[PDB]
Amino acid sequence: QGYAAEISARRNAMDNASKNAGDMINRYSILYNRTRQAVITNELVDIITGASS
Amino acid sequence: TPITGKVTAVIGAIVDVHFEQSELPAILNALEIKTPQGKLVLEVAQHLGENTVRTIAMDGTEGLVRGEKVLDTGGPISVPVGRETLGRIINVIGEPIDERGPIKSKLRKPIHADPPSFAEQSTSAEILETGIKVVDLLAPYARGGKIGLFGGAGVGKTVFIQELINNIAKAHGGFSVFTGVGERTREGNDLYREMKETGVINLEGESKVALVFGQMNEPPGARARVALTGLTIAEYFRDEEGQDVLLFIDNIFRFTQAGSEVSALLGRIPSAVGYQPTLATDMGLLQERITTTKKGSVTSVQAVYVPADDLTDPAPATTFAHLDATTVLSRGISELGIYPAVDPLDSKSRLLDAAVVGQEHYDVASKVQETLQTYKSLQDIIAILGMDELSEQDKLTVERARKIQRFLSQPFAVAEVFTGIPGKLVRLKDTVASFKAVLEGKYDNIPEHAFYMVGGIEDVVAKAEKLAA
Amino acid sequence: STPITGKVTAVIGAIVDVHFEQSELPAILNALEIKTPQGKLVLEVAQHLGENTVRTIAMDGTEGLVRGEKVLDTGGPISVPVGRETLGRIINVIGEPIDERGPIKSKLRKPIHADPPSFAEQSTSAEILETGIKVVDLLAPYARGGKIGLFGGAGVGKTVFIQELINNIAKAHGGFSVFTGVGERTREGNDLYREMKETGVINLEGESKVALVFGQMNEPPGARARVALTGLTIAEYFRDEEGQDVLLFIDNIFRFTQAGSEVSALLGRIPSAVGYQPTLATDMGLLQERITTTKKGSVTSVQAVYVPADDLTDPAPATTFAHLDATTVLSRGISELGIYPAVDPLDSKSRLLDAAVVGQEHYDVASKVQETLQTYKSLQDIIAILGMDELSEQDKLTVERARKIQRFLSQPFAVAEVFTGIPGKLVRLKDTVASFKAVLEGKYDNIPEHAFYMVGGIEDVVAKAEKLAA
Amino acid sequence: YVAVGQKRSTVAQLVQTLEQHDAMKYSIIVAATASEAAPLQYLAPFTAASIGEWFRDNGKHALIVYDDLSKQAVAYRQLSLLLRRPPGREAYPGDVFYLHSRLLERAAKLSEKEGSGSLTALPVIETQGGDVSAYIPTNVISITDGQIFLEAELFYKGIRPAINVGLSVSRVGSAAQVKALKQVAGSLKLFLAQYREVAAFAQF
Amino acid sequence: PGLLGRVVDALGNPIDGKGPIDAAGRSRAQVKAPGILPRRSVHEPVQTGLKAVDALVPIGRGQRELIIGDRQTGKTAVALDTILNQKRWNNGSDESKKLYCV
Numbered sequence A: 001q002g003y004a005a006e007i008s009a010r011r012n013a014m015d016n017a018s019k020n021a022g023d024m025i026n027r028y029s030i031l032y033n034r035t036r037q038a039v040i041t042n043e044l045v046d047i048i049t050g051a052s053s
Numbered sequence B: 001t002p003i004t005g006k007v008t009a010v011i012g013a014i015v016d017v018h019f020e021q022s023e024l025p026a027i028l029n030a031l032e033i034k035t036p037q038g039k040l041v042l043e044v045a046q047h048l049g050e051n052t053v054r055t056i057a058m059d060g061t062e063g064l065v066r067g068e069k070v071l072d073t074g075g076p077i078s079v080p081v082g083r084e085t086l087g088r089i090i091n092v093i094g095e096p097i098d099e100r101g102p103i104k105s106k107l108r109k110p111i112h113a114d115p116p117s118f119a120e121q122s123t124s125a126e127i128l129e130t131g132i133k134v135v136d137l138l139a140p141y142a143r144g145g146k147i148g149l150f151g152g153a154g155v156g157k158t159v160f161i162q163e164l165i166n167n168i169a170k171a172h173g174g175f176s177v178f179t180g181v182g183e184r185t186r187e188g189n190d191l192y193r194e195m196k197e198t199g200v201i202n203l204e205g206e207s208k209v210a211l212v213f214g215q216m217n218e219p220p221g222a223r224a225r226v227a228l229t230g231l232t233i234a235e236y237f238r239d240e241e242g243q244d245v246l247l248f249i250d251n252i253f254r255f256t257q258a259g260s261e262v263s264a265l266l267g268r269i270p271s272a273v274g275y276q277p278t279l280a281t282d283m284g285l286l287q288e289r290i291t292t293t294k295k296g297s298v299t300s301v302q303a304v305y306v307p308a309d310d311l312t313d314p315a316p317a318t319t320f321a322h323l324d325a326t327t328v329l330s331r332g333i334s335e336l337g338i339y340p341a342v343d344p345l346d347s348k349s350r351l352l353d354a355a356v357v358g359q360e361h362y363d364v365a366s367k368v369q370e371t372l373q374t375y376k377s378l379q380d381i382i383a384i385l386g387m388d389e390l391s392e393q394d395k396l397t398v399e400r401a402r403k404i405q406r407f408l409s410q411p412f413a414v415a416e417v418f419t420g421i422p423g424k425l426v427r428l429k430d431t432v433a434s435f436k437a438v439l440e441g442k443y444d445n446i447p448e449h450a451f452y453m454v455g456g457i458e459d460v461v462a463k464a465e466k467l468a469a
Numbered sequence C: 001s002t003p004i005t006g007k008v009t010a011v012i013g014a015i016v017d018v019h020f021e022q023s024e025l026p027a028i029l030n031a032l033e034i035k036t037p038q039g040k041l042v043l044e045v046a047q048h049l050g051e052n053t054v055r056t057i058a059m060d061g062t063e064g065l066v067r068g069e070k071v072l073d074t075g076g077p078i079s080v081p082v083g084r085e086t087l088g089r090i091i092n093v094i095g096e097p098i099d100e101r102g103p104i105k106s107k108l109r110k111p112i113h114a115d116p117p118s119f120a121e122q123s124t125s126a127e128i129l130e131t132g133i134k135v136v137d138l139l140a141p142y143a144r145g146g147k148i149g150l151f152g153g154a155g156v157g158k159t160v161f162i163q164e165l166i167n168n169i170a171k172a173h174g175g176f177s178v179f180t181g182v183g184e185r186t187r188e189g190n191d192l193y194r195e196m197k198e199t200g201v202i203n204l205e206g207e208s209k210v211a212l213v214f215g216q217m218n219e220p221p222g223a224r225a226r227v228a229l230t231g232l233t234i235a236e237y238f239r240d241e242e243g244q245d246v247l248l249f250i251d252n253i254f255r256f257t258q259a260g261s262e263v264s265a266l267l268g269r270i271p272s273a274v275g276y277q278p279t280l281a282t283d284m285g286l287l288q289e290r291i292t293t294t295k296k297g298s299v300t301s302v303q304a305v306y307v308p309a310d311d312l313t314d315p316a317p318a319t320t321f322a323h324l325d326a327t328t329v330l331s332r333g334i335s336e337l338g339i340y341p342a343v344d345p346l347d348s349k350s351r352l353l354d355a356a357v358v359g360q361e362h363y364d365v366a367s368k369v370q371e372t373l374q375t376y377k378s379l380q381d382i383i384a385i386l387g388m389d390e391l392s393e394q395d396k397l398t399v400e401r402a403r404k405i406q407r408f409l410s411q412p413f414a415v416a417e418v419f420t421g422i423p424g425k426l427v428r429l430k431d432t433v434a435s436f437k438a439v440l441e442g443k444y445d446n447i448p449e450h451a452f453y454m455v456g457g458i459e460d461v462v463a464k465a466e467k468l469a470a
Numbered sequence D: 001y002v003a004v005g006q007k008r009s010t011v012a013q014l015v016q017t018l019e020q021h022d023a024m025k026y027s028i029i030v031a032a033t034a035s036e037a038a039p040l041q042y043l044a045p046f047t048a049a050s051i052g053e054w055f056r057d058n059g060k061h062a063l064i065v066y067d068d069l070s071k072q073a074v075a076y077r078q079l080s081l082l083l084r085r086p087p088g089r090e091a092y093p094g095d096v097f098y099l100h101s102r103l104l105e106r107a108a109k110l111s112e113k114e115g116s117g118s119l120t121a122l123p124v125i126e127t128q129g130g131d132v133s134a135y136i137p138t139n140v141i142s143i144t145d146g147q148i149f150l151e152a153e154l155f156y157k158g159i160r161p162a163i164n165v166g167l168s169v170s171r172v173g174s175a176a177q178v179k180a181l182k183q184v185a186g187s188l189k190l191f192l193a194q195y196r197e198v199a200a201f202a203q204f
Numbered sequence E: 001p002g003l004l005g006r007v008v009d010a011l012g013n014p015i016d017g018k019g020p021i022d023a024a025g026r027s028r029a030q031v032k033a034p035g036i037l038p039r040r041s042v043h044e045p046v047q048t049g050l051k052a053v054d055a056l057v058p059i060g061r062g063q064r065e066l067i068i069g070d071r072q073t074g075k076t077a078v079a080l081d082t083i084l085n086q087k088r089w090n091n092g093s094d095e096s097k098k099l100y101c102v
Helices: A002-052 B133-138 B157-172 B185-197 B220-241 B253-266 B279-289 B314-321 B331-335 B359-377 B379-384 B392-408 B428-439 B457-468 C134-139 C158-172 C186-198 C221-225 C227-241 C254-267 C280-290 C315-323 C332-336 C359-385 C393-406 C429-441 C458-469 D008-020 D038-058 D070-081 D096-104 D135-143 D152-156 D179-184 D188-203 E051-055 E075-091
Strands: B005-011 B014-019 B030-033 B040-047 B052-057 B078-081 B107-110 B146-151 B175-183 B209-215 B245-250 B298-305 B325-329 B342-349 C006-012 C015-020 C031-036 C039-048 C053-058 C071-073 C079-082 C088-091 C108-111 C147-152 C177-184 C210-216 C247-250 C301-306 C326-330 D002-006 D030-033 D061-067 D118-123
Touching: A002 B379, B014 B030, B014 B040, B014 B253, B052 B220, B078 B220, B107 B220, B133 B342, B133 B359, B133 B428, B146 B157, B146 B314, B157 B175, B157 B185, B157 B245, B157 B298, B175 B185, B175 B220, B175 B253, B185 B209, B209 B220, B220 B245, B220 B253, B220 B279, B253 B279, B253 B298, B253 B314, B279 B314, B279 D070, B298 B314, B331 B342, B342 B359, B359 B379, B359 B392, B359 B428, B359 D152, B392 B428, B428 B457, C006 C031, C006 C071, C015 C071, C053 C221, C053 C254, C079 C227, C108 C227, C134 C359, C134 C429, C147 C158, C147 C315, C158 C177, C158 C186, C158 C247, C158 C301, C177 C186, C177 C227, C177 C254, C186 C210, C210 C227, C221 C227, C221 C254, C221 D096, C227 C247, C227 C280, C254 C280, C254 C301, C254 C315, C254 D096, C280 C315, C301 C315, C326 C332, C359 C393, C359 C429, C393 C429, C429 C458, D002 D008, D002 D038, D002 D070, D008 D030, D030 D038, D038 D061, D038 D070, D038 D096, D038 D118, D070 D096, D070 D135, D096 D135
Parallel strands: B146 B298, B146 B325, B175 B209, B175 B245, B245 B298, C088 C210, C147 C301, C147 C326, C177 C210, C177 C247, C247 C301, D002 D030, D002 D061, D061 D118
Antiparallel strands: B005 B014, B014 B052, B030 B040, B040 B052, B078 B107, B325 B342, C006 C015, C015 C053, C031 C039, C031 C071, C039 C053, C079 C108
8 A cells, every 4th residue: 555655656746846847947948048148149249349449 | 717618529428628728627627618508517538639628518418509618617526515515405516406595605625536545544343233134134234334235126225225214324313425326206206305204304404414316317427426426525524524424325336337328438448248447447436435534434325236136247246346245135035025135145244253243143143144055055956856855854944944034024114115014123132132043943833924024033923923813 | 781670660569560661571470689688579570561561479578668679680480499409408489598508509490480281291190109098098099190189177287197198108209209388387397397307308418308398478478379380390390301200299279379369469350259369270270280290200299278167169179179180088077086097088089099990809898988988977867866776787787887997097197196196007008908808898897996996907906906805 | 465456444454454463564565455546456466576576586485465366457458448459358458368477477486596485376366256267267277376266155055264175276286285284184185075976966 | 074083272283183184164163053943853862871861861962961060070971971882873874873072
């Protein structure tokens, strides 16, 4: 009875884990996208400033 | 013989004059072009030669027809100071915008001034009891110190300051300067109203506060020398009145920002991000005029609108250097509903040291910091897994830390309206007691809602009864 | 004398503009000397800007320069000294000995610039160098005539790795070598000077089997740039005219890139990515191409490279990454694991490794090692969270071998008696292949992990097993 | 002790602390406070170095702290862009590596013919965001003989003084370590390294 | 046609020194691609000899397919393999099977 509950609990827990991890994927994905854009822009600005001189 | 010139260029609010007469006014001299609006005050900032200066323009710069007479008023704009300038609100050019009749003046002093010498400095060590618990625990203010806020987009930045004015500035009972650079009109109107209401300005009485208000409507160049004006008013108090004062600056991000705007026009290759090459020097000059000499002990409160909460942006970074203590306020912690929204793992004070504020206080604070750092560390595990997958020992720590966080929320009296909860002022001795207990988990066994938005431990205990019902 | 006489017009850093007189065009890449009370300042002519006004880069420090100073022209690219007379005596960028082991002993000179050897000149190597360093020998063998490349992070003892190479390989090989240091500390310099005097490679009396060119980073960026050219030309004299097979060593070549980046800005070029010079590719290309094994001599360069903040995605390391022949990656992490050599075994790669080149057995053995390690790394994440338990019996044997192999790579070095304090061990390549083969066969999978740690060959591992047992 | 870019009040507290600890006697404080001119700030480390060289030359052994070198870089940026020189990476001038390197490399342990004179140097860099790829930090990392990384998280963690011993390195290693202290701390390095690996595993 | 078995540099100078190139024109290097109407849809395969390439990623003729990948992973080897398998077809006499690789 215990063992079945254990293996069942592990299934439940690992399922809930997948959900929690997915949310974290989404939060870091937005961060990644924002960060990627920002780097391109900031570097470009430096290049432009140099060209301007 | 007023030195006449013509307006060669009108490129933004950085008008350029060409003095026709030989020998141009020197740099940091002040000039009046007598506009059909009144006057426009300009300040020589470059000499471009051929008797052609390039001038900062301190009022509006429209309707300028190229070629306009200049008159040299000489030297830095000399504002009017006095022991009768108390309770006045003065414009950038020093004209009383509160318009309680013509300014009472005795000595008029140049806006620019040299910062007092290394030997003139007096080094304090005084404590100033704030009564705000989070402040008391984490970064106890020092009397005569330079205190700094690194808040987000007016995240109750003004509200925080208002609480300081409410507590500290009625407690202090010395002269006090409020200078608000790029303040929004509503906030300014509220402050002016509040001061008059709380009698700190008694308009038939006398005021122990003086005021400078610079709206964020004001042209960028004007805003730059609002700060310098305020520093002059402060110096008159510091020196001539010879009394320990208060000073409030809200926001010096607006000062930095204003400079960045003018910089481009001036013709400077703009340093990284965009800030002016002279960002460090200008900030430096400002922050070394603000200082505690042996002539007076100037307690300063400076507010920084961190731009998009990027502390890594150069203006906040260079601010951190010039502040004795800082109380960085974080948008996340505001969202958690903690007012004060001060980040507790990003606060520091030079006054916080075991000898200075007692070993027990330091020990208590150390444990709080460590505990909270553990909680921050276990934020990952908490999210990725659950809470039950934390170790039991850790789970106790986490539960304690959740309590500590909630304990930190203390209603403010000026925010009593906004929160809807009456404010709480909590004694320093009381604060230490409260945290001491919490670390020993003495009263820990009660809801996290109990800890939330209430004052000291006694209040928490009492609110447990309220919740228990 | 030289009618080419110039008057300085503008000293603005390394850029010093000179106003040579009518009809006097000192050709691009020439070398100008300005007599100064400091000695002779050398300026390398880098542009003609019109009407006998050149824009030149300084190679010696600038200070005290007075607008108008007379400028003589050497007439061509800096002319170094070459000979076996250059053996011994540390030679600075201009050429003057800075260890002052008597005057310039040389009887010949050559220009710093030279045209890279043609396609026809190229001779394809295949000889396989043996380093005695086990990780190198099995998992990324070096080749005699190679262009070994030590990509790695600072402070991993980048210099220490090179010192070991000099310690083993340089003395062992009869041919001359040239130790060229581009922009390195005088602390490091003194250590190197002392160390190769100690290993006797520098023979104060009697010929040294090496020449030294220590260029240090206290010299202006321009001077730092043309340390590389100088060293190369000395090597060329050996390679070509003396026909000797040499083994070049340069340190750290990121400083060469960096130096060029700095004077790029001064040259007024539009700064490229991560502030690098736009001419990054071609400048690297000229240096790298000049260094090669021809139908004349065979040069075996070992070039240190500093990878800023260990990001190989940084374009400057990546550009060099292409131009080299036998890459070696030195993992900082692995150094921290206590494994010395600190090589990143997966990332170190040499095209030299092939079943034809080093034989089928070597190849197969190395494939098995690589697979074992790659599996171990792949499983490392699983072990991290899940915990090793439900990873197969087969997996457990592979993991057990991998932890053992990981520490079997470890092997003390004599020049890290300074560091580790353990006398060096260097094992023959053929022997290393055999010894690693044994590990894979699992005949020593009864041996403790720490009895593989920081010891030489299989025989040593067995001895240390016996030692630990006692 | 060389103080660049710091407020007069901070410096003034520091000198008092040194006087309290009775050590100002052997101290020289070379200063270029925040107020003081950007050219003077740029010039300040190099003239501090000269003050050091007098010890070094004398055969005397001394130590020079250049705190914080990062503000020197900001100053040189200000100078260069108002000398209208082409802007470098992060707007710091394109010869900053040379400037910083020449400053730092003057400290040395001379030979016995020079009386074993030594200026010893400690540059100090305030890391902005811990970005080791930031231009001023990157440049300095190459130049110096060791790095002694300090970590904020560990400060909060309550290791005060905090030391990020994982990233702290000394490329010129141990030989200035006292012989006794070398013996006792022999496996301290190994133990800590094992502690780091184990601690990471232990979380999950 | 004479550039078969010729290593030439950009200017066309034989750097393998296989002497003067029997080249029947000098033709401009800045000319535009064959028009919409001048195209016939692909109908001829190319056998790379690499099994994955031959099945999983088919390669036609007169079409442009990328070879995008990580640095110096012996990218060139994968390409060179195509040249080798084409030797079989090349040996043959059909002029659609004579792919003259460059």
